[PDB]
Design a protein around this ligand. Structure first.
Ligand SMILES: [Mg+2]
Length: 281
């Protein structure tokens, strides 16, 4: 039903109409904590906030706030943390969350600079011998290795809790070719990227939830988890054509607002799922 509904929406040119109905139907829950004045500099955008009921709380709790949401997909048996690109003042918070939530992978879907503006702070070290220390959260981060491919980069990082001297290996998956405007021409490299993340074990239930971000953490980030969850459901169910991507998206939007930012991102999500299903038989 998905591939035929796709072609009929293309034929009738009603992607904006379909997308607006999702916007209208989407849940609205309070974001009281995000809106407190003391957290203004912990939010990149005024209009992108985590719901109180699903927000990630920092454990070092004098201020527990971070702009990050837990998206828990019950039937698919997969969880994701969606967050904004770290700000100059929230890089220590970002790695604290990674530590406290026991995540193994970080998925980054933007470049640090896009359209000539800073979209995210440089929150990981660029050279092995120049490690980063986050003094506010008492964490040390070391670049262990880096593998640059044409459409993405994988980095091995070592995160040390300086308080307890425990260390963990974090895998950083950086998709580096999403265009400044619009969506990719073809989903092929995005899907290959998704399967690289999968193959690493970072999405497996023995670990904490993968941390996924772009600049706002709703657009490309929404595309990534939406495609992943829909493909899992097609694999699991007796009837793969029963998977309704609009229903899955609305379910995810119960946990973080704004996921999928444009009708073009919606269309691209359909395209990724349809093409990805062909790969997984
Ligand atoms: Mg060197």
């Amino acid at each position: 039903e998905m591939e035929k509904e796709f072609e009929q929406i293309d034929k009738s040119g009603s992607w904006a109409a379909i997308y607006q109905d999702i916007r209208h139907e989407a849940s609205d829950f309070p974001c009281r904590v995000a809106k407190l004045p003391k957290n203004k500099n912990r939010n990149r955008y005024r209009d992108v906030s985590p719901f109180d009921h699903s927000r990630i709380k920092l454990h070092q709790e004098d201020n527990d706030y971070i702009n990050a949401s837990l998206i828990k997909m019950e039937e698919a048996q997969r969880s994701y943390i969606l967050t904004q690109g770290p700000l100059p003042n929230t890089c220590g918070h970002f790695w604290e969350m990674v530590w406290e939530q026991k995540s193994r992978g970080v998925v980054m879907l933007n470049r640090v600079m896009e359209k000539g503006s800073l979209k995210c702070s440089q929150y990981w070290p660029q050279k092995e011998e120049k490690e980063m220390i986050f003094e506010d959260t008492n964490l040390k981060l070391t670049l262990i290795s880096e593998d640059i491919k044409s459409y993405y980069t994988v980095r091995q990082l070592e995160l040390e809790n300086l308080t307890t001297q425990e260390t963990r290996e974090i895998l950083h998956f950086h998709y580096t070719t999403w265009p400044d405007f619009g969506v990719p021409e073809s989903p092929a490299s995005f899907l290959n990227f998704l399967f690289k993340v999968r193959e690493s074990g970072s999405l497996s239930p023995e670990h904490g939830p993968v941390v996924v971000h772009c600049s706002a953490g709703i657009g490309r980030s929404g595309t990534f988890c939406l495609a992943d969850t829909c493909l899992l459901l097609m694999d699991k169910r007796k009837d793969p054509s029963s998977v309704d991507i609009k229903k899955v998206l609305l379910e995810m939007r119960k946990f973080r607002m704004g996921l999928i930012q444009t009708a073009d991102q919606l269309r691209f999500s359909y395209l990724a799922v349809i093409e990805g299903a062909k790969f997984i038989m």
